[PDB]
Amino acid sequence: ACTKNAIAQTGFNKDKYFNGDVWYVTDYLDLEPDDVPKRYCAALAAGTASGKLKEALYHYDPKTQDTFYDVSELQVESLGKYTANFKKVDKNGNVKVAVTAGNYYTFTVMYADDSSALIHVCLHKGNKDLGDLYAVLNRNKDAAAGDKVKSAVSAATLEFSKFISTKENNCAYDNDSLKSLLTK
Numbered sequence: 001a002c003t004k005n006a007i008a009q010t011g012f013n014k015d016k017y018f019n020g021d022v023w024y025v026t027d028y029l030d031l032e033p034d035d036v037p038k039r040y041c042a043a044l045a046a047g048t049a050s051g052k053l054k055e056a057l058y059h060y061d062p063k064t065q066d067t068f069y070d071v072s073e074l075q076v077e078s079l080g081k082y083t084a085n086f087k088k089v090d091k092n093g094n095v096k097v098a099v100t101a102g103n104y105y106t107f108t109v110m111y112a113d114d115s116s117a118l119i120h121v122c123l124h125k126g127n128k129d130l131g132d133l134y135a136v137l138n139r140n141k142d143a144a145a146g147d148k149v150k151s152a153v154s155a156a157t158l159e160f161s162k163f164i165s166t167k168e169n170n171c172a173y174d175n176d177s178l179k180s181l182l183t184k
């Protein structure tokens with residue numbers, strides 16, 4: 001179940017966020033903690049490709065080796081709040097699972113600056129969801145969360161101390177695939 005109407009950042013700068021570059025998940029929190037593993041790797045690229053607002057996703061479970069990529073087309077609900085479809089793809093953009101009625105996520109940018117962000121995601125696959133999922137992002141895969149984003153976590157009435165870090169998982173990412181997937 002998802003339970004939060006996440007509030008987007010006041011004055012969110014869409015073009016800076018959706019600039020074609022990669023964001024790494026450094027820390028995450030699911031309000032239903034059992035919905036996701038205790039160790040995980042995730043990243044995304046976000047940009048406009050031929051006029052279309054896109055995200056490319058990467059998930060990797062460092063214990064099981066489960067790996068998957070997605071390409072998403074985003075629709076705008078309001079500034080910084082989107083509804084995204086998704087198709088599962090290989091790293092080269094070949095479709096494994098097509099865009100499907102009932103497979104979508106909401107995506108809210110609660111805070112962002114040039115280097116860091118806080119997002120909320122509510123994933124739906126049919127009648128299933130993956131709970132309220134918060135993630136701290138950085139442009140640098142190894143950056144410890146700084147004061148701007150940690151304060152934003154507090155301003156969301158959350159506690160950064162309770163987020164799970166991805167930093168001790170030897171996460172390695174294919175940035176080139178994430179960038180090219182934006183076009184697919």
Ligand code: HEM
Binds near residue numbers: 025037041044068086
């Ligand atoms: C970076 C923002 C993220 C977004 C937008 C996102 C979105 C998604 C989407 C679209 C899927 C379904 C993929 C498919 O079936 O084709 C998925 C699956 C999944 N995600 Fe995320 N995700 C993000 C980060 C994370 C993080 C940080 C975790 C933490 C463990 C996580 C855990 C999972 C798990 C466990 C699944 C598999 C769910 C299932 O089997 O039903 N995700 N995610």
